[PDB]
């Protein structure tokens, strides 16, 4: 059992940094990367909860994320909405 955000692994951030097109990776980056990711989920999931609770539902749908991303301008295809 481990809750401590490490599920965002070194191997994962390494590969994301690769796909973004960046080279050498000094070890200071990983904990700051986890932070910005948290803040982005804490923007989106907040409004996804408002979509779930507008219907008074007990489960988050793909629509509930999609319209939250849409109203926050970082729009997404492939899931309806």
């Amino acid at each position: 059992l481990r809750d401590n955000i490490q599920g965002i692994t070194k191997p994962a951030i390494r590969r994301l940094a690769r796909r973004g097109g960046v080279k050498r990776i000094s070890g200071l980056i990983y904990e700051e990367t986890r932070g910005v990711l948290k803040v982005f989920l804490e923007n989106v999931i907040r409004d996804a909860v408002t979509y779930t609770e507008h219907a008074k539902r007990k489960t988050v749908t793909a629509m509930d994320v999609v319209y939250a991303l849409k109203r926050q301008g970082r729009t997404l295809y492939g899931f309806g909405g």
Binding site: D3, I5, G7, I8, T9, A12, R15, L16, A17, R18, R19, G20, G21, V22, K23, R24, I25, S26, L28, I29, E32, T33, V36, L37, K38, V39, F40, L41, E42, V44, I45, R46, A48, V49, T52, E53, K58, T59, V60, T61, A62, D64, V65, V66, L69, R74, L76, G78, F79
Partner: protein, 91 residues
């Protein structure tokens, strides 16, 4: 050598698939949900859509980061050289 990492870039651009491990992402998502409101269950595809949208945010952040380091005459990333993004973009 210390540098076949450049061929990693091209290989991880030949690839397109999501990079974070599934259950590990779901744990982080649930541990952001369960102290925000009561007992949020999630349909699998919604969690996947969150994962794609967030990995896209990070790939875009690193693309901007390459510009930040390269424009600072570096071919290496450092945290300050990410931190231009949050103040220049809008957040």
């Amino acid at each position: 050598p210390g540098t076949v990492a450049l061929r990693e870039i091209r290989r991880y651009q030949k690839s397109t698939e999501l990079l974070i491990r599934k259950l590990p992402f779901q744990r982080l998502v649930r541990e952001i949900a369960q102290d925000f409101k009561t007992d949020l269950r999630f349909q699998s595809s919604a969690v996947m859509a969150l994962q794609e949208a967030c990995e896209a945010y990070l790939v875009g952040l690193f693309e901007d980061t390459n510009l930040c380091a390269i424009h600072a005459k570096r071919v290496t990333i450092m945290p300050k050289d990410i931190q231009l993004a949050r103040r220049i973009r809008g957040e």
